[PDB]
């Protein structure tokens, strides 16, 4: 009933938030399922992401087992690192590796343009650009709108 053996018994009902004692709620179903010791079949396995401690149901992010080994599990809720693109034109995009605090954050003047590669440091020569919040809104807004007008052009 212990280890990878969180698949053999209702014994690991302690998928309750350890630090707070509250219930680890999965991001998709938005509920925690544990049933009872008299109805262990109603419990649904839950796991916490290794990177950001967001709980997920194994049945919500389709999975067959807890990792417990190999690499650190990552939610489907994090941003990609490799962004393989086909336009074959298999152009690769990788997020620059984290640099020692050599690291630079040169402040924008914001608004449209300012084409960063993909690197960003959200703010209220491997220069991590500092895009704040509203710039993203406007950039997506005009991307999708000017693309729709381009489609109109076609």
């Amino acid at each position: 009933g212990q280890s990878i053996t969180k698949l053999d018994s209702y014994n690991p009902d302690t998928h309750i938030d350890s630090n707070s004692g509250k219930f680890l709620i999965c991001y998709k179903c938005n509920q925690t399922r544990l049933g009872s010791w008299s109805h262990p079949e109603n419990s649904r396995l839950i796991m916490t992401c290794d990177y950001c401690q967001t709980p997920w149901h194994l049945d919500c992010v389709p999975r067959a087992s807890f990792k417990n080994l190999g690499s650190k599990w990552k939610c489907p809720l994090h941003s990609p690192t490799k962004v393989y693109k086909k336009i074959v034109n298999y152009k690769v995009w990788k997020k620059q590796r984290l640099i020692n605090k050599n690291q630079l954050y040169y402040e924008p003047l914001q608004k449209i343009g300012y084409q960063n590669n993909g690197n960003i440091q959200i703010i209220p020569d491997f220069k991590i650009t500092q895009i704040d919040e509203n710039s993203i809104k406007y950039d997506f807004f005009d991307k999708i709108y000017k693309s729709k007008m381009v489609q109109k052009r076609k």
């Binding site: 402040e107 924008p108 003047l109 914001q110 608004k111």
Partner: protein, 89 residues
């Protein structure tokens, strides 16, 4: 005892001008320690403080982000006479 310049540093014309006590530069009453030397005394010749104030004011005025540093430059640099485009020279 640096001798102050006999021509205004802003228009390069001779006349009645006020002389800066920390540099030879002198300025006409109509062209206005100088602003540059005032800012120097404020910064105490510390480039780190200069950069920290730079970031601070760039931050506070988010509406004129595109020209923040040049706004700085106006308030730190002494006036000089206007020139037509020197594309020739």
């Amino acid at each position: 005892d640096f001798e102050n310049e006999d021509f205004c540093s802003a228009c390069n014309q001779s006349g009645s001008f006020l002389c800066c006590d920390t540099c030879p530069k002198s300025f006409h009453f109509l062209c206005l320690h100088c602003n540059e030397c005032k800012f120097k005394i404020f910064i105490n010749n510390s480039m780190a403080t200069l950069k920290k104030i730079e970031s601070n004011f760039i931050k506070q005025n988010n509406n004129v982000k595109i020209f923040a540093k040049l706004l700085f430059n106006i308030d730190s640099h002494n006036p000089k006479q206007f020139q037509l485009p020197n594309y020739i020279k």
